[PDB]
Write an enzyme that holds these catalytic residues in place. Structure first.
Site, short mmCIF file in Angstrom:
data_model
loop_
_atom_site.label_atom_id
_atom_site.label_comp_id
_atom_site.label_asym_id
_atom_site.label_seq_id
_atom_site.Cartn_x
_atom_site.Cartn_y
_atom_site.Cartn_z
N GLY C 172 0.83 -1.20 0.00
CA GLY C 172 0.00 0.00 0.00
C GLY C 172 0.86 1.25 0.00
N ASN C 221 -4.90 -1.72 2.68
CA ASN C 221 -5.42 -0.64 1.86
C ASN C 221 -6.82 -1.01 1.33
OD1 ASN C 221 -4.89 -2.61 0.02
ND2 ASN C 221 -4.43 -1.14 -1.60
N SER C 224 -5.38 -3.39 -2.99
CA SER C 224 -4.19 -4.21 -2.92
C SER C 224 -4.06 -5.11 -4.11
CB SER C 224 -4.20 -5.07 -1.67
OG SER C 224 -3.12 -6.00 -1.69
N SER C 225 -2.83 -5.22 -4.59
CA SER C 225 -2.54 -6.06 -5.72
C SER C 225 -2.24 -7.49 -5.25
CB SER C 225 -1.34 -5.49 -6.47
OG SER C 225 -0.25 -5.26 -5.60
N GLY C 444 7.00 -6.69 -1.82
CA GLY C 444 8.16 -7.45 -1.42
C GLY C 444 7.93 -8.40 -0.28
#
Ligand code: AGS
Ligand code: PDM
Ligand code: CA
Ligand code: MG
Ligand code: MG
Lengths: 142, 153, 780
Positions: C172, C221, C224-225, C444
């Site tokens: 985020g 968030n 989010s991916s 990450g």
């Protein structure tokens, strides 16, 4: 040492009862008995040999000058004390000079310690070395 | 080594310490370091122990034939150059002028290193006469000079 | 220049004017509240510098060490922070922080491009801006992502090489947003010129798609991916964009049916049932509630700033221009809505014994229509699977309720697969490629309380990028090794990091095991926990926690040790779908379905490659790192969570690793002169030399001086200790001063006492002499 001599003779008259010129071995047992605790026999006898020959007065002032040789001035004495009194109080906290003798310089031995302070002019933890020296040998009274 | 005349500086002082703790021909171990100072020396605490020495008066009495060989050691050990001290003190000076705050002196002399004694420091000052400015700081440089010098300039 | 409408993408005006600074009084000190604080040293007492908080004018105390050194009002809100005289763990905050409260949001600071999440769509992206950064280099125009590309452009064209553009940060932090803007920028500049996209709107528009399928609102968030991405843009000889191609990675498949809390399943689901396309509900048999379908109505069902409606309408248009058709577009949503109902096929703990039972049929039947194939063959072979050994089987309550939770899952993934596939097709123009630019966006490292296989991946996939940056960062030294010319060819570092990478993927590694331990239905997790420890136990270097749960082995990673748990790993490593269904669906009517189930034993076997690919592709592209940072967990703009940022900093470029250390020859003077107290470089030059400094632990340079391992530290001790010994000699000297002073009296009294002590010792002897008593007796 002058006026003392004049007072010495006085100490010579009393002793010399029969005025036999001298202090007969008996002249001692004299005033002493008529005055105090008469010394033992030998005590008396070996009390004369302390002087070379028959004691008149000159020999009397003799044996008396020896036991007074190293007599550091009353000043040097009283000034020797104040050498510790770093406050000019003409005084020392008794427990101080006390430990300052019994354990300093030469171990004032137990005995010599007592026989001293016995009359010690101590008072209020203080210790007037001034009056003590004046008494140790000197002014005051006879 | 030492010189006869030098030892005459040890002989004269020894018979002077053994005297105060009684003439017996033996000096109090603890009193040993305080003696070695009576010969233009300033051995470290730890060191003075590295050669006998004690604290409470009543551990060991040193004689002479043994007292000397001890000096033989506390003689090849480190003394502080004007620099060293200066560089050290500096590690406390932030401003630059070269002034050290009051408390700090009495602090570093005790806190760090080897605190020695409230009295002592109060004596080292009351003695070599170091006065604090009107703010609260003394120029150490000018101080450390007095110490190095000695009480008898 | 001036001041057009640069009000945010420029460190505007003269706040730099009026007012009061000292390299000592002023400095930074710890503070449980706002990180560090400004203070004025008010007194120094050795190891405890006493200062005062300039803010509330308080007066606390802080150890010299812990103190931080403040920069002058010169470098105030600097750009490429690298210029600051002070770039410490505290100096960085004062700058960036003051910048976030200005909506600056950009600082290259050194070799990076730090950018804090603002949480408030800024206007600093207009064409005026884009154009303002056309061709401009980087040291004149105010700092901003844009230029980070314009430079990554000419450092390409002019360099005839390739450029990568990674975006680090936490989750985020705002990467899968700036990666978007970097795409859009390359669009609004180098252009190539009812139905389709404009091959910009072909790429830019290809966002709401993979987002409304891969991005989901998770506690952190809201967008989010849940999938990796690596879009590449190709360039033709005319230095013009000639090709595109996306590259996704690990997708959160377990999300399809579970949302612990305050979460929403993949976007689409929430919009399909928003009734954005009324003329479509009866095409998904969908009636809109999405509070009515167990599969997506678990967590929260409506994030606060996302209007699914427009999000769908837009998602609709996206497909069209993206190069889709009525069919394709529709077919898609169909297989999409399918899952929705797929999770509404109630079942009955049937036999009062323990067996196979249909609950209703009305629902499930609906699913058979969307997907194609007949509800019969389906609900049938769904409950009575037929998959022999070159026979018929029987499924229980779980073996079915837990069966759909495999089908539907495995679908979305397959769907997504074809989805990206489709897209990378509509924008692969077999044009003339010469060099491609490229951005990579993937959260990450992450260390949840309970770490599972998925974590091993995300972390592993992230620990491979490390060896990249960490490598492309070593070069940056072997360049200031030369400027200071020393050439430390006496360092074998960087391999310690290959203790996890190698192990984690080698032909004998974990991925190699979990990838082979499936070539046999003997998927006993116990036979796995062993085989693993039967090959990697106590050999290498990897094997209590609070609020932490269950785990079987850790892995000394980089940002920490991840306690992994292989519990139920195998089945998770593939699709446990009743082959009865597969082949069945593999003959359906809908083209999408069939193609999705038409006809390298999976998912270690897709990533052990997808990654190898990405990597062996990046190491051929001049990088351009960008670090994102989250100001606050409250996600409300304007605030800065002290301890937060700080953290995010100690993972990126606050430098480092187990390299030498360098120290200016000037400063070397003050904390090291004392080690040999007996100008510049010249000063130290001798010290070490005389200190018999093991001559292998250093290399003297021109900028400053270098040391090997934590040695400066090794030296520091030789100081802290030695320095103290000095104080000793002094204090000891002080002692040697006092005694002298008293020695006069210590010897003067000598005679004094000797007087009394002997006078009396001679007085008593007299008071004990017969004669005397006699004399005193007679004192008339
Ligand atoms: N520069 C920006 N301007 C405005 N809002 C932004 C900015 N960057 C981030 N945001 C907001 O923060 C959100 C989340 O950011 P994302 O870019 O989706 O995060 P992310 O860094 O991709 O997350 P991870 O690492 O994949 S969990 C965006 O959806 C925006 O609402
Ligand atoms: C950031 C996690 C974080 O901030 N923590 C760490 C960052 C870096 C390190 N290092 C190195 O950089 C090399 C070796 C090492 O320990 C550890 C922790 C993240 O999410 O990337
Ligand atoms: Ca003695
Ligand atoms: Mg007669
Ligand atoms: Mg994202």
């Amino acid at each position: 040492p002058q006026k003392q001599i004049q007072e010495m003779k006085e100490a010579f008259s009393m002793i010399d009862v029969d005025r036999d010129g001298f202090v007969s071995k008996e002249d001692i047992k004299a005033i002493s008995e008529q005055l105090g605790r008469a010394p033992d026999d030998k005590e008396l006898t070996a009390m004369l040999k302390e002087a070379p020959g028959p004691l008149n007065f000159t020999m009397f002032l003799s044996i008396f000058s020896d036991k007074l040789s190293g007599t550091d001035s009353e000043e040097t004495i009283r000034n020797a004390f104040a050498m510790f009194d770093e406050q000019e109080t003409k005084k020392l906290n008794i427990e101080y000079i006390k430990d300052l003798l019994e354990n300093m310089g030469d171990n004032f031995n137990k005995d010599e310690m007592r026989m001293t302070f016995k009359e010690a002019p101590v008072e209020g933890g203080k210790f007037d070395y001034v009056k003590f020296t004046a008494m140790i040998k000197g002014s005051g009274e006879e | 080594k030492l010189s006869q005349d030098e030892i005459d500086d040890l002989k004269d002082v020894f018979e002077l310490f053994d005297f105060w703790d009684g003439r017996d021909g033996a000096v109090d171990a603890f009193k040993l370091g305080d003696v070695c100072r009576c010969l233009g020396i300033n051995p470290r605490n730890e060191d003075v122990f590295a050669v006998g020495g004690t604290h409470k008066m009543g551990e060991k009495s040193l004689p002479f034939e043994e007292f000397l060989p001890a000096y033989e050691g506390l003689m090849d050990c480190e003394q502080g150059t004007f620099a060293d001290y200066m560089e050290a003190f500096k590690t406390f000076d932030r401003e630059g002028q070269g002034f050290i705050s009051g408390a700090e002196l009495r602090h570093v002399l005790t806190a760090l290193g080897e605190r020695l004694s409230d009295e002592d420091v109060d004596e080292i000052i009351k003695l070599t006469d170091l006065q604090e400015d009107l703010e609260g700081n003394v120029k150490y440089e000018d101080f450390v000079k007095k110490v190095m010098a000695g009480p008898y300039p | 220049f001036s001041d057009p409408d640069f009000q945010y993408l420029a460190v505007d005006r003269k706040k730099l004017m009026k007012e009061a600074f000292d390299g000592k009084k002023n400095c930074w000190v710890p503070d449980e509240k706002e990180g560090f604080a400004s203070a004025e040293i008010q007194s120094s007492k050795g190891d405890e510098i006493t200062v005062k908080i300039v803010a509330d004018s308080s007066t606390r105390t802080v150890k010299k060490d812990d103190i931080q050194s403040m920069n002058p009002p010169k470098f105030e809100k600097l750009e490429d922070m690298a210029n600051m005289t002070y770039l410490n763990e505290a100096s960085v905050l004062y700058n960036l922080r003051s910048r976030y409260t200005s909506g600056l949001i950009y600082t290259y600071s050194g070799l990076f491009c730090i950018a804090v999440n603002p949480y408030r769509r800024l206007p600093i992206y207009t064409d005026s801006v884009i154009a303002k950064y056309r061709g401009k280099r980087k040291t004149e125009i105010p700092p901003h992502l844009f230029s980070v590309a314009d430079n990554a452009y000419q450092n390409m064209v002019t360099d005839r090489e390739n450029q990568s553009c990674l975006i680090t940060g936490e989750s985020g932090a705002g990467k899968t947003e700036n990666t978007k803007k970097v795409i859009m920028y390359l669009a609004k500049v180098a252009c190539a010129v009812k139905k389709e996209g404009s091959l910009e709107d072909q790429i830019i528009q290809a966002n709401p798609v993979l987002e409304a399928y891969g991005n989901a609102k998770t506690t952190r968030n809201n967008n989010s991916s849940r999938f990796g991405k690596f879009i590449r843009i190709h360039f033709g000889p005319t230095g013009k964009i000639a090709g595109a191609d996306i590259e996704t990675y690990l997708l959160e498949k377990s999300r399809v049916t579970y949302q612990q809390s305050a979460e929403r399943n993949y976007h689409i689901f929430y919009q399909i049932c928003s009734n954005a396309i009324p003329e479509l509900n009866d095409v998904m048999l969908v009636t809109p509630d999405s509070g009515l379908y167990s599969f997506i109505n678990q967590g929260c069902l409506t994030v606060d700033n996302i209007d699914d409606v427009e999000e769908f309408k837009l998602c609709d248009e996206a497909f069209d221009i993206l190069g889709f058709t009525k069919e394709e577009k529709q077919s898609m949503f169909k297989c999409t809505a399918s899952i929705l109902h797929m999770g509404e096929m109630k079942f009955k703990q049937r036999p009062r014994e323990e067996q196979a039972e249909s609950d209703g049929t009305a629902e499930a039947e609906k699913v058979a229509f969307l997907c194609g194939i007949n509800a019969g063959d389906l609900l049938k072979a769904l409950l009575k699977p037929k998959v022999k050994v070159g026979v018929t089987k029987g499924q229980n309550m779980n073996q079915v309720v837990n069966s759909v939770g495999a089908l539907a899952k495995s679908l979305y993934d397959r769907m997504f697969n074809w989805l990206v596939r489709r897209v990378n097709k509509t924008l692969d123009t077999k044009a003339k490629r010469n060099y491609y630019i490229g951005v990579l966006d993937i959260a990450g490292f992450e260390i949840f309380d309970f770490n599972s296989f998925e974590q091993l991946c995300i972390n592993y996939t992230n620990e491979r990028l490390q060896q990249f940056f960490n490598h492309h960062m070593f070069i940056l030294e072997q360049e200031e090794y030369k400027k200071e010319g020393i050439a430390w060819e006496f360092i074998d570092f960087g391999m310690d990091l290959q203790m996890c990478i190698d192990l984690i993927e080698k032909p004998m590694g974990i991925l190699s095991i979990l990838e082979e331990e499936c070539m046999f239905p003997k998927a006993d997790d116990k036979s796995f926990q062993d085989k693993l420890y039967q090959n990697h136990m106590g050999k290498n270097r990897m094997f209590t926690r609070p609020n932490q749960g269950p785990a079987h082995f850790e892995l000394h990673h980089y940002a920490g040790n991840v306690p992994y748990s292989i519990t139920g790993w195998l089945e998770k490593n593939k699709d446990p779908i009743n082959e009865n269904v597969v082949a069945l669906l593999g003959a359906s009517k809908e083209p999408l379905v069939a193609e999705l189930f038409k006809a390298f034993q999976t998912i270690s076997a897709v990533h052990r490659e997808s990654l190898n690919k990405l990597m062996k592709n990046l190491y051929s592209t001049h990088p351009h790192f960008v670090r994102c940072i989250i100001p606050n967990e409250l996600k409300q703009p304007g605030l800065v969570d002290a301890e937060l940022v700080l953290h995010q900093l100690q993972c990126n470029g606050v430098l480092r690793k187990g390299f030498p250390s360098r120290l200016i020859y000037s400063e070397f003077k003050q904390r090291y002169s004392i080690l040999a107290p007996n100008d510049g470089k010249t000063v130290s030059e001798k010290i070490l030399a005389g200190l018999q400094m093991d001559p292998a632990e250093y290399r003297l340079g021109t900028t400053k001086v270098f040391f090997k391992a934590g040695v400066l530290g090794n030296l520091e001790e030789m100081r802290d200790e030695r320095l103290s010994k000095i104080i000793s000699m002094f204090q000891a000297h002080i002692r040697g001063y006092l005694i002298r002073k008293a020695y006069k009296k210590l010897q003067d009294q000598r005679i004094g006492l000797s007087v009394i002590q002997r006078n009396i010792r001679k007085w008593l002897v007299l008071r004990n002499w017969q004669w005397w008593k006699l004399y005193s007796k007679v004192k008339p």
